[PDB]
Amino acid sequence: MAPSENYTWKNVRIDGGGFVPGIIFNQKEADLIYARTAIGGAYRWNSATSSWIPLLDWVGWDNWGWNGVMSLATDAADPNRVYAAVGMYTNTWDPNNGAILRSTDRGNTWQATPLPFKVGGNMPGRGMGERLAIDPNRNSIIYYGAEGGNGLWRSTDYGATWAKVSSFTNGGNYAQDPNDPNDYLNKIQGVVWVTFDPASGSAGNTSQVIYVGVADTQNAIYRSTDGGTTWSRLAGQPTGFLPHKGVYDAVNGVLYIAYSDTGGPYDGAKGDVWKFTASSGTWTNISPIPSSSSDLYFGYSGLTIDRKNPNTLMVASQIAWWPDAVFFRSTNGGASWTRIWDWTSYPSRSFRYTMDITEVPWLNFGNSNPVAPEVSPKLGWMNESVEIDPHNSNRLMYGTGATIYATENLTSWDSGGQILLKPMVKGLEETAVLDVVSPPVGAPVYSALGDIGGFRHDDLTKVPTSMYTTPNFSSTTSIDFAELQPATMVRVGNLDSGGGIGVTTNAGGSWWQGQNPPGVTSGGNVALAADGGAIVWAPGGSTNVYLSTTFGSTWTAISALPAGAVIEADRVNPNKFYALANGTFYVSTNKGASFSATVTAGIPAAARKFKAVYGREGDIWLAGGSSTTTYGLWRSTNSGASFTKLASVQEADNVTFGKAATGATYPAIYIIGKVDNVRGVFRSTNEGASWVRINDDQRQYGNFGEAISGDPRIYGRLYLGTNGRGLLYGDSA
Ligand SMILES: [Br-]
Ligand SMILES: [K+]
């Protein structure tokens, strides 16, 4: 067994960067707040440090889908208890079923009960909820609205065991696109929320009245009046739409429901907000703008009630992409509303809010000259979760596709003032890291991220001012620096429907955009010669890989390389480039103009990660494989002429190098992999002869390791990319 060494793991500070489909306040305990994410686990707010604490970093390599958090419930009767429904996809992309996780210590530790079906924390419909709900009068009882047509599920033993509720017989019939050939939009979204009437029981006794939301346009709302023994469609309900939210107020005895014509979170063209009064059975359409009006171009979600003053409620657009989201507020139970912005004289608007992003300045997306009617930063989008603090009428929080915004002066709206919104995402690190580099001079690390581009990180403790611009990719798929002239850098990535390339000669002080070769539909990957004098780019979509000798102004096709081959430059000899594709290794000795196959056997076809070593010409390490084929770590010391498998590694998925141990003759090597039957993150300081585990079972981060980098200046340091937990750095303790 590889021994473990004590390490300190932190996030490189970005603040947010991903979608928060759910914010959940505990109804009895003030400042107890959780957030659920689509791909990056769940978090608990720590009010003493003003930061979020991740709760699911123990999810590892084989159960990686558990970082998908489709619902979370926090127990009002016992605030130490918390539950989460987990799993990431309901198609083939997650090979595993979902689970309900249960905790008696606020998510410090958990136990899992696997479900007999999949959970879709990053599927369509994931902003509808909460599907998981605890009986507020009898906390042994929990319900889960399942996806897929599996219907309504229940535990009566504090989450330990779960079974289908036989008497609930509508599992839902809506998929966003039932004929999607991509097999992503075509899954039944199912039973979407469970909401109790707390006045229908008392501490210790089963709540008799329960409402359930179903993604069925003709049967959206069900009710039990006998503690879930029997269920019936609620009479007199509206039809034609899907209920994103169902929020019940026992003070006035009213169920509010926000509907949309799709499951969300990316779309929604029509919907309504309805009010059901339980005492009389009355239905009222309280839509700020009803779907019968041609002025309405979004559905509704973001439904929340002010628990301290329950005549006050809010709802929001699901979805207004243009000109921005709108939020609506009523203080008289929906009889009338005002809106957070208004047209004054088109394209100008008046606003009931201001926004301060000085703690997360990249949220303007590098745009400080937006064209009216747009502003920058925007109010938001994918704003399915909007929540008034049940202990403080002045606090509200909402999730977007990029952040959590919060206000602490919400009732200023009601006196004609402007609420202040600010990000509230310190510690909540949700980005997918696609590539990462650590040069030997200047800033310690550069990130290449999905959705927000990525950054030069001048200080790992300080949020970068802006993502890369000119060009500004949505996702940077690959970045490189010229080993011998590190201020020269290149990056490729995704831009409005296609791809492109950005180059720089002052280490990203400023970039400019190069021209494209034919057929580019996405960034793919790129390599920069060691002296900065050539670029080899394998774009997505293109039929070829291309060379530039003009720093991206012009290109020429490379005849031998398959489309999309993984390219790496030698870090010493500017004339050497390498490529890997599907079991074949290829080398160029003429600075990228041509390549030739050198190895066609012994390398697993699945391997797609390799790297040349700084300071060591022709020294290459290669990681990959699969459990059905062959798997491990290979090394060449002859510029790719041949590879030797390391006997010390059972499986490896990526490899990088950093500063040598004092006295050692070779850089430290870091891998993502399996060594002596243990999965994790390993360091070798003797050329791969033996390994030390530098992570631990609480710090596994799921499907991590697509991008890793050692640090040539700092012994022991590893920049560890994740898919949903940002960019970590680990240091020897
Ligand atoms: Br829109
Ligand atoms: K819309």
Side-chain angles (χ1 to χ4, degrees), residues 266-286:
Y266 293 122
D267 55 8
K270 280 307 208 175
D272 289 285
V273 185
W274 286 79
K275 190 179 172 162
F276 172 76
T277 303
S279 60
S280 63
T282 287
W283 290 90
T284 304
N285 183 330
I286 62 166

Side-chain angles (χ1 to χ4, degrees), residues 268-269 297-298 319-321:
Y297 63 104
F298 45 86
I319 187 156
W321 293 105

Side-chain angles (χ1 to χ4, degrees), residues 22-24 32-35 43-44 52 55 72 74 82 106:
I23 293 152
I24 304 87
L32 176 56
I33 326 180
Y34 296 89
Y43 294 82
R44 187 182 72 257
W52 298 97
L55 311 177
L72 185 147
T74 175
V82 66
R106 308 176 172 228

Side-chain angles (χ1 to χ4, degrees), residues 180-310:
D180 178 21
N182 299 148
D183 195 53
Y184 179 62
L185 304 173
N186 57 339
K187 303 306 169 190
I188 294 297
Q189 294 187 14
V191 178
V192 294
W193 48 261
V194 182
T195 297
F196 287 94
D197 168 1
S200 67
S202 48
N205 313 106
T206 301
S207 291
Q208 296 302 289
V209 178
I210 312 163
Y211 301 91
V212 171
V214 179
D216 177 349
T217 59
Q218 306 306 116
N219 303 111
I221 318 294
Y222 283 80
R223 185 175 65 177
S224 183
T225 57
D226 58 7
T229 303
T230 63
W231 300 85
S232 294
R233 150 188 218 290
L234 195 53
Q237 73 183 276
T239 57
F241 304 94
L242 307 169
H244 280 229
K245 297 287 167 114
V247 178
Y248 190 85
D249 165 34
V251 174
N252 299 292
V254 299
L255 179 68
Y256 297 104
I257 305 141
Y259 297 84
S260 182
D261 65 332
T262 76
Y266 293 122
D267 55 8
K270 280 307 208 175
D272 289 285
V273 185
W274 286 79
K275 190 179 172 162
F276 172 76
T277 303
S279 60
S280 63
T282 287
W283 290 90
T284 304
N285 183 330
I286 62 166
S287 300
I289 312 169
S291 60
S292 59
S293 168
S294 61
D295 295 346
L296 189 62
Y297 63 104
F298 45 86
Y300 294 97
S301 193
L303 181 62
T304 178
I305 181 147
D306 179 339
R307 300 304 182 177
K308 299 291 234 61
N309 294 281

Side-chain angles (χ1 to χ4, degrees), residues 651-702:
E651 318 177 338
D653 301 86
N654 209 347
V655 59
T656 191
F657 322 103
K659 184 174 183 175
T662 307
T665 49
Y666 203 80
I669 309 134
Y670 298 85
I671 62 170
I672 299 301
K674 178 180 184 186
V675 168
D676 300 326
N677 300 299
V678 174
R679 262 281 170 182
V681 181
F682 302 91
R683 184 189 71 206
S684 177
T685 50
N686 54 20
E687 255 180 283
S690 72
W691 304 85
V692 171
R693 189 176 172 195
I694 68 174
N695 77 325
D696 71 80
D697 283 355
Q698 297 309 119
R699 294 187 178 71
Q700 307 199 86
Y701 319 103

Side-chain angles (χ1 to χ4, degrees), residues 2 42 73 187 230 234 294 319 326 329 352 409 502 530 557 601 627 641 652 689 729:
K187 303 306 169 190
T230 63
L234 195 53
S294 61
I319 187 156
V326 199
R329 183 172 168 87
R352 308 184 188 273
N409 68 327
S627 62
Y729 61 114

